[PDB]
Amino acid sequence: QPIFLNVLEAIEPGVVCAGHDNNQPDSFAALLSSLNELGERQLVHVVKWAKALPGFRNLHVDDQMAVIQYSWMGLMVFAMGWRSFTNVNSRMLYFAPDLVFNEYRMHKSRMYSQCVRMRHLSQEFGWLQITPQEFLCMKALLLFSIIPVDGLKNQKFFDELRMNYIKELDRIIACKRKNPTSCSRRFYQLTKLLDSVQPIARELHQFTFDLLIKSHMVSVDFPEMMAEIISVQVPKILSGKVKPIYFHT
Numbered sequence: 001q002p003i004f005l006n007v008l009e010a011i012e013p014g015v016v017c018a019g020h021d022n023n024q025p026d027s028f029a030a031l032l033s034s035l036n037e038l039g040e041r042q043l044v045h046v047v048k049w050a051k052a053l054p055g056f057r058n059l060h061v062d063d064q065m066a067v068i069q070y071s072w073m074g075l076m077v078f079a080m081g082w083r084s085f086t087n088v089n090s091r092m093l094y095f096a097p098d099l100v101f102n103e104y105r106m107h108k109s110r111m112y113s114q115c116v117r118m119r120h121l122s123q124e125f126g127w128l129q130i131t132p133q134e135f136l137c138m139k140a141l142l143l144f145s146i147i148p149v150d151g152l153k154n155q156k157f158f159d160e161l162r163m164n165y166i167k168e169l170d171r172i173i174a175c176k177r178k179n180p181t182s183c184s185r186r187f188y189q190l191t192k193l194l195d196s197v198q199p200i201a202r203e204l205h206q207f208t209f210d211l212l213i214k215s216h217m218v219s220v221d222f223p224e225m226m227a228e229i230i231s232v233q234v235p236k237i238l239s240g241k242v243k244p245i246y247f248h249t
């Protein structure tokens with residue numbers, strides 16, 4: 001009352017810096033090494049955040065880390081889109097206060113197309129007039145949006161958790177949203193927005209995987225924790241063993 005939203009607001013991560021050297025000419029090697037470091041810092045925070053979510057400990061211990069790892073990229077993308085919207089009106093990609101991507105950096109990073117999709121996702125927060133509370137509920141739903149095609153250790157607990165988060169988003173749209181037809185229109189919009197995160201995360205995963213494999217050749221540094229997740233968990237996604245749960249299609 002509103003207990004659920006109270007929680008989401010309480011656990012939302014603070015500012016996370018990349019540690020990028022902005023006082024020197026951009027280089028593909030430097031920019032990507034900084035995204036890798038930032039990526040690792042975010043994963044660390046995403047784990048603490050996820051573990052504090054209502055019902056999260058209902059999941060089996062093994063399912064817990066798997067769900068975090070599979071969902072990590074999408075969660076990062078979604079939160080980054082929001083920061084971009086709120087801080088710079090979606091004009092640039094606000095990865096961190098010390099790692100803001102303008103068009104030049106988007107190009108230099110060699111992930112221009114992926115950045116353009118992320119920029120579009122950020123613009124949608126404005127076009128759809130996403131509230132901070134809708135954003136928090138959607139980001140939590142995102143954690144429960146990608147699983148092994150052949151289920152988890154205890155799939156039932158996960159299914160119940162997902163259903164409960166869907167219900168929370170519902171209440172949130174209905175809180176001040178009059179008569180049904182409007183709630184339906186809004187749920188339709190948000191579910192479409194949520195689904196749109198998955199293809200972006202997939203493309204980012206593909207690029208990251210490719211870069212890791214050739215990392216030694218391009219002078220890109222991958223922290224050990226990243227190398228492990230990208231080589232062990234990410235291929236399960238790229239090979240189709242683990243897939244997103246789409247609302248539509």
Ligand SMILES: Cc1c(/N=C2\O[C@@H](C(F)(F)F)[C@@H]3[C@@H](O)CCN23)ccc(C#N)c1Cl
Pocket residue numbers: 032035036037038039040042076077080095096204207208211226
């Ligand atoms: C999309 C994104 C990030 N992207 C990435 O992190 C690196 C990974 F290896 F960590 F995945 C890799 C890089 O090699 C190529 C894209 N990946 C990194 C940090 C944030 C943030 N905040 C966001 Cl939104």
